[PDB]
């Protein structure tokens, strides 16, 4: 049964008419918030006199 049964072609459309626009590009922006915390103190007690 040695025979050619099927095939695939590397054909494509020529986009004279914009049938396919492909991938899209748009601008984006991200925002990162970095608030600064206040940290625990270090204390040096002394006599008030």
Partner 1 sequence: NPIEGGVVQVLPYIAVMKDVYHEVSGVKMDNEEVNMVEAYRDPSILDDE
Which residues lie closer than 8 Å to 13 by C-beta, 6 or more apart?
19, 20
Task: Give me the 7-46 binding string for partner 1, x by CB under 8 A, dash otherwise.
Answer: --------------------------------xx-x----
Binding flag, residue 3, partner 1 (CB under 8 A): no
What is the distance between the alpha carbons of residues 49 and 39, in angstroms, rounded to a whole number?
Answer: 29
What is the distance between the alpha carbons of residues 19 and 24, in angstroms, rounded to a whole number?
Answer: 14
Closer CB to partner 1, 23 or 39, in the complex: 39
Residues in contact with partner 1 by CB under 8 A are 39-40, 42
């Amino acid at each position: 049964d040695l025979a050619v049964i099927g095939f695939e072609l590397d054909t494509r459309f020529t986009n004279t008419n914009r049938r396919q626009r492909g991938h899209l590009l748009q601008t984006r922006a991200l925002q990162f918030r970095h608030p600064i915390p206040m940290h625990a103190p270090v204390t040096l007690p002394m006599d008030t006199m």
